[PDB]
Amino acid sequence: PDQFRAIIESPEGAGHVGYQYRRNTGSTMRMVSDVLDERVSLWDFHCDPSGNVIQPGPNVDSRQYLQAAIDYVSSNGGGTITIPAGYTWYLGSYGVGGIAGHSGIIQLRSNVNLNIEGRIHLSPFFDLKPFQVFVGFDNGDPASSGNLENCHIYGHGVVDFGGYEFGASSQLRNGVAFGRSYNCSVTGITFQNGDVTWAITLGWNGYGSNCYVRKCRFINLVNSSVNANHSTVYVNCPYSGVESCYFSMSSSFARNIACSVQLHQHDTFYRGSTVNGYCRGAYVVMHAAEAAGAGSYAYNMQVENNIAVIYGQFVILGSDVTATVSGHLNDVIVSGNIVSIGERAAFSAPFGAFIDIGPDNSGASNVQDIQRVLVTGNSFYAPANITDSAAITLRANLNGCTFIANNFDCRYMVYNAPGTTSPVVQNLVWDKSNVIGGTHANQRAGQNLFDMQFASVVNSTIEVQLSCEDLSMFSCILFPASCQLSYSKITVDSAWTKSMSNTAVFEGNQQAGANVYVSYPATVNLTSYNTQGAVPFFSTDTNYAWVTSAYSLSINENLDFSPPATYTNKANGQLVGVGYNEIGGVRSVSVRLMLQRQV
Amino acid sequence: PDQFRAIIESPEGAGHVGYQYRRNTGSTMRMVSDVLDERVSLWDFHCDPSGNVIQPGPNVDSRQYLQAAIDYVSSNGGGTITIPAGYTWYLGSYGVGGIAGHSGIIQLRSNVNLNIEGRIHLSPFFDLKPFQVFVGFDNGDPASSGNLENCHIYGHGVVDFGGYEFGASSQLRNGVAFGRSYNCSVTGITFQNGDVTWAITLGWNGYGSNCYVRKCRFINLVNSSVNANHSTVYVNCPYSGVESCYFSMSSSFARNIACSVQLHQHDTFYRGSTVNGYCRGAYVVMHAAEAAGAGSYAYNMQVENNIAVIYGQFVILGSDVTATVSGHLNDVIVSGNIVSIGERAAFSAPFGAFIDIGPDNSGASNVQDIQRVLVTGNSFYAPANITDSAAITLRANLNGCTFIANNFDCRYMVYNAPGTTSPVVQNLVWDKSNVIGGTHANQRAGQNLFDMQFASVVNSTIEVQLSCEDLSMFSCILFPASCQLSYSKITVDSAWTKSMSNTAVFEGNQQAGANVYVSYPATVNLTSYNTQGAVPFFSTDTNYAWVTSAYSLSINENLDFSPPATYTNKANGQLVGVGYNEIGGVRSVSVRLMLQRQV
Amino acid sequence: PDQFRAIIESPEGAGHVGYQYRRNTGSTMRMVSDVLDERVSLWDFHCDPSGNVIQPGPNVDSRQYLQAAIDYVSSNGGGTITIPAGYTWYLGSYGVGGIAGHSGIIQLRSNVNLNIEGRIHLSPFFDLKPFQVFVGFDNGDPASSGNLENCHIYGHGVVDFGGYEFGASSQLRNGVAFGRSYNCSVTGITFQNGDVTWAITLGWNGYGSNCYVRKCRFINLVNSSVNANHSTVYVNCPYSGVESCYFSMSSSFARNIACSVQLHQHDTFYRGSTVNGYCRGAYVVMHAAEAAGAGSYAYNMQVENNIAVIYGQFVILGSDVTATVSGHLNDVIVSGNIVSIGERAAFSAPFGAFIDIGPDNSGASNVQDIQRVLVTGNSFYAPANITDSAAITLRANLNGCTFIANNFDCRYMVYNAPGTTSPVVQNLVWDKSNVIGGTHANQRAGQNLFDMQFASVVNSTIEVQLSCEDLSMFSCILFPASCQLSYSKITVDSAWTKSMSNTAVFEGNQQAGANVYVSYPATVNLTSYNTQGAVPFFSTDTNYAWVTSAYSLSINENLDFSPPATYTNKANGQLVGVGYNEIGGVRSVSVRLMLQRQV
Ligand code: NA
Ligand code: NA
Ligand code: NA
């Protein structure tokens, strides 16, 4: 009797009060403690050394308590700890042990999920300092770390970096560094209000699998000039990806340094997301120095169905090499994305592009092995004032990239700056189904729509089709004499081109090559013999040794004669056709022709 | 001893029974009440004034109890109330205060989520009456309402409107009216069995953000002739959207009035959903009178990867103006959708269309500013009997819309009714990669496949390519004399067209314009001079002053002569070519030619 | 006093300890038991006949306990049973009653969800035996079974089939057989480590609705030679689908027998998933013997945005018939998928294909009714050594299929083995926007890129466009004399084709048909008359009665004359053109021409 009150008021008391589910005679006879033991919260470990519960807050470092929770539940084979709603839980110190090396705060462990319903906020302790809030490595050296398996973070809660700036550019900052991560995920969480390098990294140098980020929000995660670089999510293990996320920045600096996602390993995806205020949408890249876990090929890379306002490049391709590994990038699809360059002055941020073939980090452009890339069904728009805007900026070696059924409304279709890199290009394919918009019409004085500033182009197709007039452009497509061209097909549709002085320009007359197939409009002057009847007409210039046929794009205003409808050429480089003189006399005309070579 | 039994049986008793998580010496020493206080249900507030629990049911209005729950949890900084499974909770009265003005039942509040596992059902009180079940405004005037933040509704439960009809057309009915809503969502819920205006509205006139509807079901939400209009989900704040939802109607009235989604603000999306039995798939629209919260441009509008059986129009574009605001719609992508018009009699429901450029609500067609729209990679099908079916019904001013790589199998490709609106059209682009199906072949007597009933067309491309014969159609494309045409490209591929009397028709000979680029097949009669040898042939008609070249689409059955392969023209409007007379004599032939102008 | 201790220690004790939510004076006065009664776990039913809790494990069959849980909660109108984390719950026996007939273990019931957080593992009892772990039928005969409604399985847990092989090929094995299933779903679960037929089947012969599988993982679910066939998920009710799943196999046998998904009913989808190591991506099929629940048409079938490495066919189409039902398949879209055939020897697994039109299960190829299929915006790749690789293997009757804007890099574009089936083909459309890759260049000796081994082709379009040279191929497109051709358009673009001996081959001269529209390059020898001036040239061969026009694809090396630019024909089958002799004399030349017929 007397001792019973004692048990009950004691910590063992719920262990002495019996329960049976809904008075069901078949249900287990248990104690209240057992049913309470089926869930677990931060409250169960957020206490002083006497077991008295401590209230979280500005002046309480909840780090050790959350760590004890994770360590204990890890002890029992796993489960899910709730971080309670209606409370803000401040972290005010570094973790210890193997996460020491990673500037860790909290160590994640296998099979221990966190359901974050409340808010987690970083304390001023962390101002001007590196940090990585959650860390799945168990060792300061990642090569010697064990794995993190079956760890899920989710809920409706928030993680907040307290608005503190970086202290030096050299510092790193992360939200969730899963480590060598297998079956791990972040779902539903808001990450906000910081200056960090990443919010989440999945995998480490290819080690890991089936990691995902889904329905999270990323807001204002760069805020100072000191921050050297940002990629919100870093997918660095295969069979992993990001979907249905929302990414937003408002800092000027973000527009210069910040990317939403990097995909660095095979079978990874970025889908169904919305981006605003970033410099870059996605890096898709095989880095040789991150190839230890999952081979040296990144393949099956998908970027689909995203919405974006960016200030530089939507999708950046790349590959590179190290002393002993060579990186390859192949089998990539980019489709269904709708993307625009936001309002900004020309040249005020990295050069705007839907696709960029970037050089490596040291800036080498002759190490890349990028091929079998499919860009299809996307739309891109840049405002008319943005000189530095392009469907593709092709700044490094390219072994293939195929464009079909896109809509591009910007300054250049193909661009590379002259006298910079001289890319070697193979298997660039620009199908005629790509629609070229008109927003930059009349803006293109001194400029070439496809400006082919390359070392050489082979096995490529450029099928230019305009949709409106732009008589300001210097040419539709220009190849400088420095660029070799062979086994390629280059064509300009005559629509909207009749008043153009130059349609296709080959500055080293490269269209003469044995295996070059071209067609484009030009104005030609002809003069006939004086014979009544069937009568030949010849070009006055001799620039046409390469032409296999030509046909009229002009009406004939004359009654007493007609020039030929079609032409071929002669050894001396003249065009020749058979027209008709109703009445005799030497004729002289200027006609618009479609010139054709092997097509 | 004596008093102890008293405490324990009392409401404070669980506050006196100690608990420690799994007898762990490091875990907090708590009371049972504390752990029970970590969750909260309707059961905790569904009681009489004495604290005795009340059973929900047909004759119990659970409204006040749920409201007390929400108000209390709101009190503590938020959390999640469970609406328990295995029970139906009837609502039988209006809410009070600021939701009064919105016909509100339950008021939502910030950070208070509802996990709906059971069923919520409307009582007969609400028959023939307006209602809005859940309401995030705090004020009857929305302009003076505060915000709703971080409010999520989810679970496997059901909301049921009890099958009651509208009382008058003027009435409104909604399920979740989030109000000025920021980070709010509805996930997993079934909405069923009613006659309402919307099931869910996100945002209010552009105020709000990051609102979503995901994996919900909408079933039989229109059922009477009195219901004036329905849109199941109304996205009226940016960075918001609908995905992976299911929408179904079985009412005849739904096929005339009901739309699945309206997107009314920037950066919004509708994806991965299935629709059946509706009139309309989606409205995508900038309404000037809903532009107070997020500017006057709707841009970054995405409709992707949906499945639909509808009776009218899949995607409706629009923009309009008010005295002081002008609405603009730009940067829209519609792709990957597979859509069909369900079995119905011709003209039995609003005119079937994949895309409709609709006039404003007053029916004005000269106020719209719609451009940079990309329609790609969709398929559309209407059954052969449905005269009123079209890839695009272009009923109002259009400043651009680009079609690429679609498959359209219906009655018209481009349509507008004659002598209705006279749209001004710019930058309409119909790429040759659009495939035209054959289901309506032989159904097109007296009809034009592309029936261009416009005030004028500029900077547009129509590249017609058939895939099968339809000799019933009057023409492939017809421009009435009333329609101006300039700086456009119009072409008809000869495949399947050889037996066509008319391919392209220009009723005011608009193909003669300086900047009009065309090509299409026609039959022409020619007669030659009698000269042996090289000999000219001339058209007997003089309708060809506009032709720059023509070429044969016919074989030559003759041995003693051949007509020219290619033709040009003369000032008098004749065609002329140089053929060959092996033996002399005047020749006369009818040939099928490809006529070409500046192409 | 004395009796009170008794109550409290007893199973009714929590029913005597009072609780009030957060000491709120307005909250219900309840007992602890009531709040505990709001959740329910396996622990509440995993006891001996005395109510003592039993620990799960290798030597404990948890089947009867889980079944009692489900039966009881079913009793109360539904709810969610947690299968606890940190524990493995072994199943060691068959269920009884109506699931007896289906080799059932656990019977599912309506409104009873399972939240699987721990692991469920099959005991050795099941080695070499059939089994179906979860079963929604209530009757051994499915035609007499009731329905399963509102049943959801989800969590972060695992289902594991213990690695046991099939005992005989005739046996069936499943994970979740939902039965006649309406609003049922599987979310988040890993299925692993077995030898089964399916992991999940939704619906039964068209009965059921709104069933989905989302974010699940399927790993190593085939492991022996005895397993006759595998499809991981079997969607057999409408308005149902699979998304964002991960499928992986490592068994050799899987590459020969295993498919990731079959869609067998209308309005079903397969999206956003990743596949590795399987033979097949998806079957999309109307089976007449599975048409009792939802009609005989499968329509609105979507396969979108998936990533795959497979060894046979990505998407298999089919339809078939029974004595009294005829199956139809129409309105299908396949887009945005990126797919490759994994490294393997040629012919080492079923013939690699992006699309396969397969014959029925008995192998009949004349029963199918497949039409309105849209394949767009996909990429496909097979390694260069894989002879047996194709964009489409067209092995049975086809009533339509449309390809647009794809990238195909494999051995064949269109293929069927000769002297096997002789498919009747209608409305096959291969748009010019399809890009043909170069990986198999130089591998195609004795082979035809489009090898049209059909009974007949009508209303079809093949627009061949190469992107690089392959002079190893016998032809770009070949029609054997056995194949009829009519009302079709067949064309070969001259780019990369100038050195080809054969471009298009018609072995029964089928290009002569009245309604056949073609164009392709050929080399032709001509000789002229000796006349000075305008002078005709004629082909030495008489194979050209069908040509309507031709034009030069060669330059003219000569000065004293030029051959005609364009040609027509004569009754005797010669080509004839008018060229020019500056100086007289008989000329003789070999030119590359574009031959054209009615285009
Ligand atoms: Na060079
Ligand atoms: Na007009
Ligand atoms: Na035949």
Automatic annotation (TrEMBL), chains A, B, C:
It comes from the Viruses. GO terms for molecular function: endo-1,3-alpha-L-rhamnosidase activity; metal ion binding. It is found in: Virion. Keywords: Calcium, Degradation of host cell envelope components during virus entry, Degradation of host lipopolysaccharides during virus entry, Glycosidase, Host-virus interaction, Hydrolase, Metal-binding, Viral attachment to host cell, Viral tail fiber protein, Viral tail protein, Virion, Virus entry into host cell. GO terms for cellular component: virus tail, fiber. Its main location: virion. Ca(2+) binds at residue 101. GO terms for biological process: symbiont entry into host cell via disruption of host cell envelope; symbiont entry into host cell via disruption of host cell envelope lipopolysaccharide; virion attachment to host cell. Belongs to the P22likevirus tail fiber protein family. This is Tail spike protein. It comes from Enterobacteria phage HK620 (Bacteriophage HK620). The gene is 9. The chain holds residues 112 to 710 of 710 of the full protein.
